[PDB]
Amino acid sequence: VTGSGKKPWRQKGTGRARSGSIKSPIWRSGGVTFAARPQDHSQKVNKKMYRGALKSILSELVRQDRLIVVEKFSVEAPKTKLLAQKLKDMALEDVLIITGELDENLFLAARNLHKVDVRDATGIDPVSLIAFDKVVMTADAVKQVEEMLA
Amino acid sequence: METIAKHRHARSSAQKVRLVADLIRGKKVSQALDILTYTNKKAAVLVKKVLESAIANAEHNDGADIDDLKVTKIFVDEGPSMKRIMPRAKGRADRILKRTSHITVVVSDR
């Protein structure tokens, strides 16, 4: 606290409590008793536990039919209109598209649908897998991800 | 109709004015005016200048009949007490309070 360190009043004589510095956490405009440091909250989850988490999330996506597997699936013009119409055809609304490789057209088409995210077969993650309504995995991505999980 | 006439931030305590205000209550204005005119106080001046108002705001807004006009409800409320500082012996300072009072008069045909 930008201040001084002088006893605001002597130790005796005063009728008020024994105080030491205008900065004390008690006082108004004083310091916080335990000021939070800028910390890190990254916690280590074992490689094996992360793999064993994905190998369970995917099995349950299968069991819950939220995993729609397809062959090649992209577009020809980077038109979010085109991709949205394509999803209308697929009768879906909120989908994580795990393609084999980021197809710049598909990526640019999905950039602007806040219910659709296109990820390569490697940048997948549990939070997204679970959160998104349905995940569509091109068979390329299926093979890639199963070999990644090993 | 109960005509209201107030006086906010009146430069007078909230007790010295209640002393007067409790004299005139439920009394015909024809008598309350006399009482206040021949009351030896300073709050008498405030409450009389306010009762004059209430009567006038009755006769020029709510109709007429200064004849039948009782002081239905009159009350004095604490107001924003101005702080000031007065010095005492041995350097000590004591915060004195210039008091203020919201006078309210409510006169009705009744």
Partner: peptide, 14 residues
């Protein structure tokens, strides 16, 4: 206010 004086010499109850 900002200054406080010392109190009177207390009772010499020696």
């Amino acid at each position: 206010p900002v200054y406080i004086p010392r109190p009177r010499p207390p009772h010499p109850r020696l």
